Design a protein around this nucleic acid. Structure first.
Lengths: 287, 106, 97, 62, 252, 176
RNA sequence: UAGGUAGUAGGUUUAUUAAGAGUUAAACCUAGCCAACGAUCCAUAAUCGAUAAUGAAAGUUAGAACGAUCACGUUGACUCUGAAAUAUAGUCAAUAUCUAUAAGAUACAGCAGUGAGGAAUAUUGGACAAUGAUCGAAAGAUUGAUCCAGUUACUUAUUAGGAUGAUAUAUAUAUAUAUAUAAAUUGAUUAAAAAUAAAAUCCAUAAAUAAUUAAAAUAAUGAUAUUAAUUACCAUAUAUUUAUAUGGAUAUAUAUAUAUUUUAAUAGUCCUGACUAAUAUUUGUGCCAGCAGUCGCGGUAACACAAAGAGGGCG
C-alpha cells in the first residue's frame, strides 16, 4: 500500500505530497502532463495517474471515488482574471486533516502526517484526534507534537559511526586549516566508537563544544543541532484557508478551499486542464 | 410494574454498548419496537459524557432525552402505563407527581 | 460566445445526419460533450458546455456540425436586441456571484 | 455442450464437473464453458499465469 | 505512439551515458537527478544545488529549473553560477541563463514550476500579531471593521486571536523549545510579510440532593425521535462515520 | 436514498402521525356550525342533491353534520371532580386518587390546548391570510404604475378601440 | 382464451347479521349485467415505503436487509370458544412418523441442530445485566422475545511505518572535501531499465508488561468481558496541554547525585494488438499447442498462444 513501481521513483515521474529529494527531482524533471497526442480517455488517464499520486496518494480509488464531490466551491469570496474552478477538484482532500497537515508543513509527507495523527501527535481543538481520515472544518485548530514537527522540519540523527566520520573528516580539515595557517590533532576511531561521550569530549572544535555532529544531543533522536530538513522550500506552500504557526507547531483550518480569479486555495502543482481531465474522469465515476 | 392496555415503553433502535431507548407509547398487544401509537422521544442509556475536567467538577455526564413532556399528557391523562424509567422521568421532570412512585427498591 | 465560456442558449442544429443538442451550463460545469466537441470547445474557448449527438454520431460530421452550430444557431445577445427593437439584459452579474 | 480450457485435461466419461458461462466463438456449439478447478477437472500443470481462470494454486517453491 | 507514455527522462537536455563499464550497471534517470544534485559531501548532504539550504530574507526559493533550463548548481559562498564541463569539473557558464537574473517580480511567489494560480501567502508580521492580540483585549473594535481596518480576512484576524493567546501562554510557560526559539526565525524568512499599507432543556428542578445527570430536551410529537426504516446504509460504502466527543470514530 | 425521501429534504423518515387529542370539530366554532350546516349548493356540484329526485328514505338526504364536541363540557363528562372530599383514610389510596386527578388534569389541558390549536387555525391564520390579500395586490402595485417605456406597447390601441366585429344592425339585416 | 354470465343484472319482500348488499339463506318479479380501452378463461407472482439498487431525469429493477400490509403454520373442511379466529385450538377426515395399541400422540414455517435438495447461506453458545412480555397483593418466577458472544471478507469502514538512503576503504568556521585503492548484482551498449528498489542507519508505535477501570444501570444486579478505554514507579495536587515541587517506589558507588517494563512490521490479483492505461526487450512454439466480451490471434523473425524481463490496473 506504499510501494507500487515506487513512490519516490525518478523512473515514476510523479510528484508526491512529500519533501523528499527523489520526489523533488520529479518536481523539476517534469514538464506539463503530456496531453497533445492523447485521446479523451488517455488524456483523462494521464491526468488521474498524475493528480492522484499527489492529490490523494494514500486514499484508495474506491474511497476517493466516493470522497470526490461532483459539485465544487469556487465562488470567489470578496476579491478581471478567471477563477481556476476545476482546480478545486481535490478540495475534499485539502479539507481532510491528514492532507491539511502536509499543507501546514508539520509532516514531511501526507503519509507521515497520517502516522503523526495515528501516534496521537495531531490534536484538533485540543482533542487528540488519531484519525487521518477526519476532515478538518472551518475554525478547527490542528496541532502536531513539536518533536514530530522537528522530525518533519529537521534531519534525522546519523549513526554514531557516521557522526565520527563527519567529525574525523572535519578534524582532518581542521588539521589542514592549521597546516595551511603554517604555510600562510587527529582524534581516534575505534576508541571513539567505544563511547559516544568519550568521542564527543575528545572531538572538540570551535563550534563543537565536546559533542559529535548530528549526535550533539544523544537523547534527541533527531539530528543535533537540529539541522533544518532540506528540500522544504520547493514544497513550502502555505494555504490562506489553513492558518499555520511553525513557531508553536500549531495550525488552524480557517475555511474550506475557495477559488478566486487566478487563485485556488487547493495546493495543486497540476494545471487546471490536468485537474479538468482528472475531474472529468471522476465525474463519470472513473469510467 | 407498569403494564396495562395502553403503555409507554422504550423502542430499541440503538446499537451495541449504547442501545438508545426510544420513549414511545404503544398498546399492550403492540410490540415494543412495532410502530408505536406515538413516539414521545428517545432516552439514551449512557449519559452523554461532559468535559473530563467538568466530570471531575460538579458537572456530570447527562443523557440526551427527546421525551415530549406536553405530549405524554394526552396519554398520561387518557391512561397509559409509562415504563418505570419513563415513570420516574415524568416524576423527576415534574411531568407527573413524584408519588407516581411504585415504591420499588429505588 | 456568452460571458466568454459557454454558448448563448440551448441549441439543436441538425447537420446532415448528426443531430447535435448542446446546452449551456452554469459557470464551472466543465466541458461535458462528445470527445470531438470537447477538442473543438477546447480550441474555440468554450469551457462550460454539455450536450449529446443522436442519429449518426459521424465523428468528423460532429466536428463540421459543431462549428456550424456555433455560427448558425448561436445569435449573440446584441443581435436579438437590436433586431427585436428592444434591449435584453444579463442578471447573473447584477448579483455578483 | 461445454469447452475445456487450458492445455491439459482430465475428461473422463462419467466425471462430475461444474459448468460455467461463456461462448467458444470457434466451436459453433459450445455455449457453456467448464471450470478448470472443480469436481474432477484439474488445474493445468505449471500453469504460470492467469492461474485462477485456469485453476492452480500459487506454485510454491523450496 | 499516440499514447506510448514511457520513462520521465528530463524534459531539458542532460548529459547522457555511453559505453558503460560492463559492471557499471547504471541508469539514465539516476544520472539525471544525480546532476540535479552535486558531488555529495562528507557531511552526506550536498554543499551546492541551485536551492540546497534555505532562503533568509522573506523572498521564497521555489524551484525554477524552467527559466534556468536545467543547470542548477550555484556556489554556496559567492552565490556564483556553474555548470558541468567535458571532463567533469564544475565551472561557470558562458551565457547568463537570462530571465533568472530579472525573474518576473511576483513570479517568485509561484511554488509549483507549472500552475500559475498557486501563490504562497506572505507570513504575518510580529507587530501585526502583537498589535492584533492587544486590540481585541483592550476594546476589540468590530473584528469585521478591524479586519477591514487591517485588510486581514474576518476569520483571519479572529484565528490570530486564538493563536497569539496560545503563543502568549506558551511564552509564559516557556514551553517554546529552544528549537522553535530559532526554527521560527527561518520560517519567518522563507516567506514574505503582509500588512504593507494597502429555556434550553428540562432541569429547572432542585439540582441539589437530586441532580439531572438524566438531562433531557423538550420536543414536539411528529418531528421528534428516530424513524422506522432509514435503511442503515451500513452495508453500503457511504456510512456516516462521526467522531466521538471523547476522540473516537463513531457511527452516526 | 429513496427518490421519495429526497423530495422531503432527503433525510425524512416515515412516522405514525400523532393524532391531536381533539378528535372532532368543536362547538367552539359557531361559524364552522353554519360552515358545516348552512344550505349546500345543490347545483352543478354533487354537494347536496336533486330536488326532483326523491332520496332513498332511511338515508340522510344531505351530508350528516359532524358532531361538534364541547371541549369544557366533555372535559368533565370524561373526567369530573370526585364526589366525596378525602373519603379515603388510607395514604396509598389518597396518592392513587391524586396520581388520578393528575391524569385527568392533563386530559383537561390537552382538550383546551387542542381547541386553542383549532381556534388560531380559523383565527390567526384567517387574520394572517388578510395580510396575504393585501400583500398580493403589491405584486401589481409596483408593476401596474406606468413604466418609463409603456408607449412602445401602447401603439396599436386604435386596433382594439375599433369594433373588430359589430355583426349586423336590425334593419341592416332587414335590407339584406 | 371471444364471447362470457344465470344469482348472473337489477327490482321487490322475508331469514339471519352491530349493520348496507345476491352476502348468505329464502320467496317472488323482471331482463339484465360484463366485453377488442380486452370480457370470461388460463398462467405466473405475496404486496408496498419517507427501504435498497441504477440514471441526468423520466423511470427501471429488487424485495435479502429496515419497516408497513397480507396470508399460512402438514392438507382439507367444519365447530366451539371468544368483542375479534374456520384459531399453530378443537372436531372429522387426508398424508407421514412414534408411545407400542389409546372414540392414542406427534407434524421445528419458535431457537439451536440433522439428513436432503442446491452453485450457495452460521452455534445442538451465554445471560435474563438491559429493553420489553405473561403470572403474582408482594416477595420473584418464567421468557431461544430480547440482549450478548460464536461461525462466515457476504457488505461497509478502518488500519496494515515512517524519515533517509545507490558501494567500501587508505591518506590528507569553512570551503569546490580531496586523492588513491579497489570492488560494484539483474538486465543493458544508450534516452533500457530493475532501482530508493533492496541494505545499514534511522525513528516511533501495534503488540508484549505492570498500572488501570470507566459506561450500557442502577436500589442493587453487566451475560458480554481477555470490558472499552486510559495507561507508563507512583501518588499529591499543581499549572495551560502543561509543568515544577514533595514524599514515598526505586537508586549506585561508597541516605542521593540520578535512572525509572519492553517493542515489530508484512499482498495479492488481473491485464499489457485495438477497443482499453500498460514501448526494454526476449523466448518457445509452429493454423499445432492454446487464447478469445468484440475485432480476431496462431503456416519463415506471434505485442493476441506459454513464458522471462519490463510495465499498467484493483487492493
Amino acid at each position: 500500500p506504499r510501494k507500487a513501481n515506487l513512490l519516490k521513483s525518478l523512473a515514476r515521474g510523479r510528484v508526491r505530497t512529500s519533501f523528499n529529494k527523489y520526489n523533488l527531482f520529479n518536481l523539476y524533471k517534469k514538464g506539463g502532463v503530456d496531453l497533445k497526442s492523447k485521446s479523451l480517455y488517455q488524456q483523462k488517464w494521464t491526468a488521474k495517474q498524475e493528480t492522484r499520486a499527489y492529490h490523494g496518494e494514500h486514499l484508495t480509488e474506491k474511497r476517493w471515488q466516493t470522497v470526490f464531490k461532483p459539485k465544487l466551491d469556487s465562488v470567489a469570496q470578496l476579491d478581471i482574471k478567471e477563477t481556476p474552478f476545476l482546480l478545486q477538484t481535490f478540495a475534499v482532500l485539502e479539507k481532510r486533516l491528514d492532507f491539511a497537515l502536509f499543507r501546514a508543513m508539520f509532516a514531511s509527507s501526507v503519509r507521515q502526517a497520517r502516522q503523526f495523527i495515528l501516534h496521537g501527535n495531531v490534536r484538533v481543538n485540543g482533542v487528540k484526534i488519531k484519525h487521518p481520515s477526519y476532515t478538518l472544518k472551518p475554525g478547527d485548530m490542528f496541532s502536531v507534537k513539536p518533536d514530530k514537527v522537528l522530525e518533519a522540519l529537521g534531519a534525522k540523527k546519523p549513526s554514531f559511526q557516521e557522526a565520527l566520520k563527519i567529525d574525523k573528516t572535519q578534524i582532518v580539515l581542521w588539521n589542514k586549516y592549521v597546516k595551511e595557517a603554517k604555510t600562510e590533532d587527529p582524534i581516534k576511531l575505534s576508541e571513539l566508537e567505544g563511547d559516544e561521550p568519550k568521542a564527543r569530549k575528545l572531538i572538540n572544535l570551535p563550534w563543537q563544544k565536546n559533542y559529535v555532529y548530528g549526535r550533539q544531543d544523544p537523547k534527541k533522536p533527531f539530528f543535533t543541532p537540529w539541522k533544518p530538513r532540506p528540500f522544504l522550500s520547493p514544497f513550502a506552500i502555505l494555504p490562506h484557508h489553513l492558518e499555520i504557526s511553525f513557531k508553536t507547531c500549531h495550525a488552524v483550518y480557517l475555511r474550506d478551499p475557495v477559488a478566486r480569479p487566478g487563485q485556488s486555495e487547493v495546493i495543486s502543482p497540476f494545471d487546471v486542464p490536468v485537474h479538468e481531465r482528472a475531474y472529468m474522469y471522476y465525474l463519470r465515476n472513473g469510467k | 410494574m407498569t403494564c396495562g392496555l395502553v403503555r409507554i415503553r422504550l423502542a430499541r433502535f440503538g446499537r451495541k454498548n449504547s442501545p438508545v431507548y426510544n420513549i414511545v407509547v404503544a398498546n399492550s398487544r403492540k410490540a415494543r419496537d412495532a410502530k408505536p401509537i406515538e413516539v414521545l422521544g428517545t432516552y439514551v442509556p449512557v449519559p452523554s459524557p461532559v468535559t473530563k475536567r467538568e466530570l471531575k467538577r460538579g458537572v456530570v455526564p447527562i443523557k440526551d432525552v427527546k421525551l415530549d413532556f406536553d405530549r405524554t399528557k394526552y396519554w398520561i391523562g387518557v391512561g397509559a402505563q409509562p415504563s418505570e424509567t419513563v415513570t420516574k422521568l415524568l416524576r423527576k421532570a415534574g411531568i407527573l407527581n413524584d408519588a407516581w412512585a411504585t415504591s420499588k427498591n429505588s | 460566445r456568452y460571458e466568454n465560456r459557454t454558448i448563448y442558449g440551448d441549441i439543436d442544429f441538425r447537420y446532415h445526419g448528426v443531430k447535435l443538442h448542446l446546452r449551456s451550463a452554469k459557470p464551472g460545469f466543465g466541458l461535458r460533450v462528445n470527445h470531438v466537441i470537447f477538442e473543438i470547445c477546447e480550441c474555440a474557448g468554450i469551457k462550460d458546455l454539455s450536450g449529446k449527438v443522436y442519429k449518426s454520431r459521424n465523428d468528423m460530421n460532429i466536428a463540421k456540425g459543431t462549428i456550424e452550430a456555433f455560427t448558425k444557431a448561436q445569435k449573440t445577445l446584441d443581435e436579438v436586441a437590436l433586431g427585436r427593437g428592444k434591449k435584453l439584459v444579463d442578471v447573473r452579474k447584477v448579483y455578483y456571484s | 455442450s461445454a469447452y475445456i480450457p487450458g492445455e491439459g485435461h482430465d475428461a473422463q466419461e462419467h466425471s462430475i464437473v461444474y459448468v460455467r458461462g461463456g461462448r467458444c466463438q470457434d466451436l459453433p456449439g459450445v455455449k457453456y464453458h467448464v471450470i478448470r478447478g472443480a469436481g474432477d477437472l484439474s488445474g493445468v500443470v505449471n500453469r504460470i499465469s492467469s492461474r485462477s481462470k485456469y485453476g492452480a494454486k500459487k506454485p510454491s517453491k523450496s | 505512439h499516440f499514447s506510448r507514455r514511457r520513462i520521465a527522462y528530463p524534459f531539458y537536455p542532460f548529459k547522457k551515458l555511453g559505453r558503460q563499464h560492463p559492471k557499471k550497471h547504471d541508469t539514465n534517470l539516476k544520472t539525471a537527478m544525480r546532476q540535479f544534485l552535486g558531488p555529495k559531501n562528507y557531511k552526506g548532504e550536498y554543499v551546492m544545488n541551485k536551492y540546497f539550504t534555505v532562503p533568509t530574507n522573506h523572498v521564497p526559493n521555489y524551484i525554477k529549473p524552467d527559466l534556468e533550463r536545467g543547470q542548477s548548481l550555484e556556489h554556496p559562498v559567492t552565490k556564483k553560477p556553474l555548470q558541468l564541463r567535458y571532463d567533469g569539473t564544475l565551472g561557470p557558464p558562458p551565457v547568463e541563463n537570462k530571465r533568472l537574473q530579472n525573474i518576473f517580480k511576483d513570479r517568485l511567489l509561484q511554488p509549483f514550476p507549472s500552475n500559475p494560480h498557486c501563490k504562497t501567502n506572505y507570513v504575518l508580521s510580529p507587530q501585526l500579531k502583537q498589535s492584533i492580540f492587544e486590540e481585541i483585549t483592550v476594546e476589540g473594535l468590530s473584528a469585521q471593521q478591524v479586519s477591514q481596518k487591517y485588510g486581514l480576512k474576518i476569520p483571519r484576524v479572529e484565528a490570530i486571536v486564538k493563536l497569539v493567546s496560545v503563543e502568549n501562554s506558551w511564552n509564559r510557560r516557556n514551553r517554546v523549545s529552544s528549537d522553535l526559539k530559532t526554527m521560527d526565525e527561518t520560517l519567518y524568512r522563507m516567506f514574505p510579510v503582509f500588512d504593507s499599507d494597502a429555556t434550553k432543556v428540562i432541569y429547572g428542578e432542585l439540582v441539589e440532593g437530586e441532580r439531572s445527570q438524566y438531562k433531557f430536551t423538550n420536543a414536539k410529537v411528529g418531528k421528534v425521535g428516530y424513524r422506522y426504516g432509514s435503511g442503515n446504509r451500513d452495508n453500503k460504502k457511504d456510512r456516516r462515520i462521526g467522531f466521538n466527543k471523547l476522540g473516537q470514530m463513531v457511527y452516526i | 436514498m429513496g427518490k421519495g425521501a429526497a423530495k422531503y429534504g432527503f433525510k425524512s423518515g416515515v412516522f405514525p402521525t400523532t393524532r391531536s387529542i381533539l378528535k372532532s370539530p368543536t362547538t367552539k366554532q359557531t361559524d364552522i356550525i353554519n360552515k358545516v350546516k348552512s344550505p349546500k349548493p345543490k347545483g352543478v356540484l354533487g354537494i347536496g342533491y336533486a330536488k326532483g329526485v326523491k332520496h332513498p328514505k332511511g338515508s340522510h338526504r344531505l351530508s350528516p353534520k359532524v358532531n361538534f364536541i364541547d371541549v369544557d363540557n366533555l372535559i368533565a363528562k370524561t373526567v369530573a371532580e370526585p364526589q366525596s372530599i378525602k373519603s379515603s383514610n388510607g395514604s396509598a389510596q389518597k396518592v392513587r386518587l391524586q396520581k388520578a386527578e393528575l391524569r385527568r388534569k392533563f386530559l383537561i389541558e390537552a382538550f383546551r390546548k387542542e381547541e386553542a390549536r383549532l381556534l388560531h387555525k380559523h383565527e390567526y391564520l384567517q387574520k394572517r391570510t388578510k395580510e396575504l390579500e393585501k400583500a398580493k395586490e403589491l405584486e401589481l402595485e409596483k408593476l401596474n404604475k406606468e413604466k418609463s417605456s409603456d408607449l412602445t406597447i401602447m401603439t396599436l390601441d386604435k386596433m382594439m378601440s375599433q369594433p373588430l366585429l359589430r355583426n349586423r344592425s336590425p334593419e341592416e339585416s332587414e335590407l339584406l
